[PDB]
Amino acid sequence: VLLRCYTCKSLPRDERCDLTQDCSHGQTCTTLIAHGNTESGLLTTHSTWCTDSCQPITKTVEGTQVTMTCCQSSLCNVPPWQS
Amino acid sequence: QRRDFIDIESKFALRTPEDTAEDTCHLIPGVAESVATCHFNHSSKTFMVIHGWTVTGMYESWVPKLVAALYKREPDSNVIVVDWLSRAQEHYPVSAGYTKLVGQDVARFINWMEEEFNYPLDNVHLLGYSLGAHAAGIAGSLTNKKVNRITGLDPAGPNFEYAEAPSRLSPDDADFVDVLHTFTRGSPGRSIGIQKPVGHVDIYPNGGTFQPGCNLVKCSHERSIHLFIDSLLNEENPSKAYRCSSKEAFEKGLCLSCRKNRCNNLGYEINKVRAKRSSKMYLKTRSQMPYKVFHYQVKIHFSGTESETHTNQAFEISLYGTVAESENIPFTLPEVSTNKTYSFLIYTEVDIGELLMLKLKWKSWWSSPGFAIQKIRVKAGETQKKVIFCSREKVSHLQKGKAPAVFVKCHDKSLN
Numbered sequence: 001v002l003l004r005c006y007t008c009k010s011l012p013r014d015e016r017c018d019l020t021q022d023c024s025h026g027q028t029c030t031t032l033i034a035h036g037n038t039e040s041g042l043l044t045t046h047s048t049w050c051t052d053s054c055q056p057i058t059k060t061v062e063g064t065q066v067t068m069t070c071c072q073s074s075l076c077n078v079p080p081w082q083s
Numbered sequence: 084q085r086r087d088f089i090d091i092e093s094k095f096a097l098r099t100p101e102d103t104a105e106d107t108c109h110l111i112p113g114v115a116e117s118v119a120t121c122h123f124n125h126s127s128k129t130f131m132v133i134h135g136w137t138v139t140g141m142y143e144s145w146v147p148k149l150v151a152a153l154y155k156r157e158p159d160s161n162v163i164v165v166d167w168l169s170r171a172q173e174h175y176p177v178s179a180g181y182t183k184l185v186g187q188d189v190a191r192f193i194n195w196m197e198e199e200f201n202y203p204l205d206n207v208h209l210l211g212y213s214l215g216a217h218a219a220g221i222a223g224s225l226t227n228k229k230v231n232r233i234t235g236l237d238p239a240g241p242n243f244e245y246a247e248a249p250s251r252l253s254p255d256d257a258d259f260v261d262v263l264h265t266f267t268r269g270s271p272g273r274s275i276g277i278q279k280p281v282g283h284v285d286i287y288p289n290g291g292t293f294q295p296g297c298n299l300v301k302c303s304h305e306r307s308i309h310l311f312i313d314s315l316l317n318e319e320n321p322s323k324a325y326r327c328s329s330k331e332a333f334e335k336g337l338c339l340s341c342r343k344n345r346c347n348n349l350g351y352e353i354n355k356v357r358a359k360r361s362s363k364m365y366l367k368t369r370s371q372m373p374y375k376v377f378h379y380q381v382k383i384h385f386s387g388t389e390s391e392t393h394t395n396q397a398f399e400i401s402l403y404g405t406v407a408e409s410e411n412i413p414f415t416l417p418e419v420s421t422n423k424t425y426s427f428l429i430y431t432e433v434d435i436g437e438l439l440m441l442k443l444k445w446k447s448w449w450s451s452p453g454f455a456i457q458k459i460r461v462k463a464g465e466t467q468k469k470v471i472f473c474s475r476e477k478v479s480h481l482q483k484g485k486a487p488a489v490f491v492k493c494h495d496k497s498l499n
């Protein structure tokens with residue numbers, strides 16, 4: 001069973017991904033979410049894509065909280081605030 | 084029978100894993116009895132260490148290190164040290180000519196093994212350093228059938244660089260010939276190490292001109308040995324070399340592919356890839372063991388409103404991964420200009436893991452020059468993946484001597 005996942009590069013907190021692509025066999029949908037301070041203020045981004053390898057993680061890289069999430073369901077790679 | 088082997092000057096000592104330094108037991112050609120005395124395992128693979136020139140007529144520091152590493156990796160094998168110190172201690176053009184006879188001495192000994200004990204030549208791996216590499220080549224072109232492998236550890240360049248195939252180490256000499264060129268600094272025919280490709284696979288660590296931690300007058304020359312010792316002691320984590328058009332093309336990160344055997348392992352673990360033409364292969368290393376570093380091609384498109392050019396500019400990139408991080412990696416760019424893409428190689432000793440964040444810093448009357456960059460494309464050699472990093476905000480501003488522009492991962496594509 002194949003997956004159509006969301007494929008959108010670095011989108012702001014209030015922007016829902018429109019683009020979708022049927023993954024290569026074995027891939028899992030993924031979401032990378034970022035939350036830290038910028039020159040503008042406290043910004044939240046969310047990128048999504050089909051990934052051959054997916055390890056879910058959460059690390060605070062030099063002040064910015066980066067969160068990787070994996071899911072084997074079609075169109076499941078949606079940020080926690082958009083589901 | 085020893086009546087036909089009497090003319091052989093070179094001695095063949097079989098060292099044990101517990102006796103690496105001395106030439107205690109000798110395999111005497113023509114005396115079949117000796118082979119048993121020395122406890123040669125006829126079921127095991129055979130390694131033959133052929134040293135280079137030595138002005139003192141003495142085995143160097145590296146001989147018991149190479150022996151001991153071969154017995155750590157392959158403890159059941161047979162390690163023979165070909166003693167040619169009497170011929171090796173001479174004037175260089177003399178010792179060089181003596182390769183023609185050391186090669187013969189070896190070939191004759193090997194051929195005797197196959198004749199007297201029906202020992203397979205496919206079980207023989209020869210390893211020669213400097214002049215020793217050519218002795219191995221010559222020996223290989225003289226054995227009855229073709230020997231398994233020959234490793235060229237920085238083959239001597241003078242009088243060999245312009246030498247025809249039979250008079251030097253060449254790809255016809257074994258089934259597989261892997262070469263490590265580490266000190267090619269100099270004019271052709273006047274470099275310690277040979278410059279030209281002489282194997283099936285020729286590796287040029289750090290472009291093979293000289294070595295990290297070397298600029299004690301044979302540091303860059305010997306390093307080919309310690310890179311092989313590294314390969315035997317760290318079998319699970321070998322350094323990768325990538326097939327490139329030139330060292331200049333390598334430093335731009337243009338060759339970093341593994342497709343159609345365009346990359347291989349440095350050392351013992353090497354994949355035996357006989358190519359149509361000799362493939363020149365490049366990589367970067369550390370100053371000390373383990374020498375493996377991780378290679379990355381960083382592509383940056385410097386966008387902006389007004390046209391500007393800035394020559395020999397200094398930058399610092401910082402890589403943040405899942406496992407660890409390597410901050411303040413420095414680099415320089417011949418030219419940087421408005422609406423232009425620049426690709427360059429970045430290497431690091433640190434296993435950072437999967438890339439997440441990337442910070443780019445430009446190092447410094449007037450307001451500082453600056454470009455607005457949206458995306459950075461990274462290709463990671465070892466893991467064969469294409470990673471896109473894009474600015475958290477619409478665009479990140481990289482301005483000379485100011486706060487570093489921040490980019491977070493937005494894509495992954497594994498190339499295979």
Ligand SMILES: *[C@@H]1O[C@H](CO)[C@@H](O)[C@H](O)[C@H]1NC(C)=O
Nearest residue numbers: 123124125126127128159160
């Ligand atoms: C010879 O080598 C093999 C490994 O290929 C090993 O299993 C065997 O025990 C060795 N024989 C002797 C005499 O040690």
Ligand SMILES: *[C@@H]1O[C@H](CO)[C@@H](O)[C@H](O)[C@H]1NC(C)=O
Nearest residue numbers: 386387388389390391421422
């Ligand atoms: C660079 O490209 C952008 C469009 O991508 C354009 O608006 C800008 O004027 C260009 N700058 C120069 C110096 O050509």
Ligand SMILES: [Ca+2]
Nearest residue numbers: 062401408410
């Ligand atoms: Ca820090």
Ligand SMILES: [Ca+2]
Nearest residue numbers: 248249251253
């Ligand atoms: Ca030859």
